[PDB]
Amino acid sequence: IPVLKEETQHATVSERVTSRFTRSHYRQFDLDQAFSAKIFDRYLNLLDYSHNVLLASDVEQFAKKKTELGDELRSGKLDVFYDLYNLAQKRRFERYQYALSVLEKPMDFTGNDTYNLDRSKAPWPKNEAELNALWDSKVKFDELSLKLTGKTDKEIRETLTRRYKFAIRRLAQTNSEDVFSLAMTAFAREIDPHTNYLSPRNTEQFNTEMSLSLEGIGAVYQMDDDYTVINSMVAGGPAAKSKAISVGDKIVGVGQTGKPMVDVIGWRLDDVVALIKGPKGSKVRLEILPAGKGTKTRTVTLTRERIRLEDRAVKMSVKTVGKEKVGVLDIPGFYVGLTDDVKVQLQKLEKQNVSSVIIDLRSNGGGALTEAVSLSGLFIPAGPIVQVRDNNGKVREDSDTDGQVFYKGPLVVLVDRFSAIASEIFAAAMQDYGRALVVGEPTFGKGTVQQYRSLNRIYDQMLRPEWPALGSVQYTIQKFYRVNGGSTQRKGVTPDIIMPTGNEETETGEKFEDNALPWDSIDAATYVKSGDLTAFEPELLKEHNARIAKDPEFQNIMKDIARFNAMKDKRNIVSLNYAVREKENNEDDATRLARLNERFKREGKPELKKLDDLPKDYQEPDPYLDETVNIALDLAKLE
């Protein structure tokens, strides 16, 4: 395999990269030895997430000088990363040699053995034997996954073999930029988890340009390990519009109209992503493992489009209970024109004489801070909305100037785990003004913005035919603050009323993220509260808690939360006993089929004969919305 080598331009990029982070990142940090040490470890974990490749012998050879990397990045002298990447690429190959062998060996799932899915805290293997034991276990796990999939012994040995060959092929497919990226990745993600190095565009982009404006599914992908994951969906992109794939789901397989389905376990991110993308109005076939460690996969077929703005658009509806009326705005995202679209929706809402109005920001990871401000100000007359703090410690206060409220009546803002930024600042501000009730779950808590700078400076193509282009940096320039003076960072907005889901722990939120910047305050801005809704909390809670206690969906929701607690201590570990696993799957299905048919009883639908039979258009009801409509009407009555 051609040995990977830093390219000439890399030197300067490193210098330029290090400049910007060191000096201009929101976070005032010391790129000292200690900092360097942590990077080193972070890089190691990139090379070998699973700590089942590198030999402990190898590790210390590089580890003894982990404090050098500060100066190394500054002087653009990066061979330490490259030598260690070239190692651990060598060793990765040793693994695949072994693993192919073990496929041949006959295998039985009769024994009571187990598999741990998190070796991130594990010991670095000490010797050949230990490697072979760990790799034996990986192969056994893969064979079983496919047996439970429903593949035959033969095709299991064939399909695993294919994957491992591609891993070897890939090993040689990678290149200098791939290494360098990864070095930057180690540096970037040690300042905070939203700082990034974005590699330049290659030939492949050029063909995108000869190709159309513009070709994707509006999901933002990254990678932990062998497995690709979704962090973000773009509002009104087909991913989001399908409502099938979600945040956190792992992608395992992609396909086209003619061709059979293609395994993407253990890839380079670029390669998985490339396979997805297609000419507009195309289709693509997608295969996902929901959440984590479900061990069951579903298929999602994406009508490839390019974002229709009416998919992007605010959607208005009017719910009714008895004779009472509740305007509902689903606002997908904080799009330009939101506040104007909203003003027009308020027009229809006054025709219909609604007694209260829900703003539904659920799974709305933001958009324009501009629009967030405008909207806040439709419900408060004039006043500050948000405090913006920059990479100089300077504070800007963004405010509404209308001395007008376009809608005066009660207001609920409904938020969840995945509500973010503009949603959070609007939700925060509605709380701080005591102008609305918040309902749902703790919000994501992303309280910072980033920006891109190009690494290209104007003189590069007068003084070079280096035209390899340089990449960009993306990094924290601002932290957002409430008008109460708390940041939304890590805590987000905590609703007045927590729906059942929000009373537990979770995998997700800015707070659970690797090295997220900590919560803090600044001094409260000066505002004119629009009312006080603390009087109303106990009767609101009392009736809310009562209603959902008698409610089938909330009852079911509770059990699945209770069950989650009861069994979640045993998540990391899976049985390698085939029949246990098949029984786990079978017990799932029974639970599921019973729960759906129960629903259909109450909905007056004909009951399901099998779970096999669920139509692939099938949508869940919305317990939270229904209940929030109720809370909204209570609130209207209370005033």
Numbering used by the authors: 32 to 670
Quoted from the paper:
Prc (also named Tsp) is a member of the family of C-terminal processing proteases (CTPs) which features an embedded regulatory PDZ domain inserted into a serine protease domain. In Escherichia coli, Prc is involved in degrading abnormal proteins that are unfolded or partially folded and marked cotranslationally at the C terminus by an SsrA tag and that are exported to the periplasm through the Sec translocon. By associating with its adaptor protein, NlpI, Prc is also involved in the regulated proteolysis of MepS, a lipid-anchored hydrolase specific for PG cross-links. The activity of Prc strictly requires the PDZ domain, and the PDZ deletion completely abolishes the protease activity.
We determined the structure of Prc-S452I/L252Y, which is indeed trapped in the unliganded resting state. In the structure of Prc-S452I/L252Y, the PDZ domain is docked inside the bowl, interacting with residues, mainly from NHD and CHD, dispersed across a wide region; these residues constitute a total interface area of 1,595 Å2. Interestingly, the docked PDZ domain makes little contact with the protease domain; the only contact is made between the stacking side chains of PDZ Val278 and Phe449 at the back, and this contact anchors the PDZ domain in a specific position to expose the ligand-binding strand b4. Compared to the structure of the liganded activated state, in the structure of the unliganded resting state, the docked PDZ domain is repositioned to expose its ligand-binding site for the substrate C terminus to an open space above the platform. The two-β-stranded substrate-binding hinge, which is formed in the activated state and which connects the PDZ domain to helix h9 and the platform, is unfolded into two coils; the critical substrate-sensing residues Leu245 and Leu340 are separated and become solvent exposed. Helix h9 is drifted away and partially unfolded to make up the large vaulted space above the platform. Lastly, without a folded connecting hinge, the proteolytic platform is angled down with misaligned active-site residues: the catalytic Lys477 and Ser452 are apart from each other, and the amide groups of Ala453 and Gly398, forming the oxyanion pocket, are out of place. We found that limited V8 proteolysis indeed resulted in the two fragments from Prc-S452I/L252Y but not from Prc-K477A at various incubation times, supporting the flexibility of helix h9 in the resting state. For Prc-S452I/L252Y, crystals were obtained in a solution containing 0.2 M sodium thiocyanate (pH 6.4 to 6.8) and 20% PEG 3350. The crystals of Prc-S452I/L252Y were found to be merohedrally twinned with a twinning fraction of 0.42, as determined by the Phenix tool Xtriage and as subsequently checked by the CCP4 program TRUNCATE.
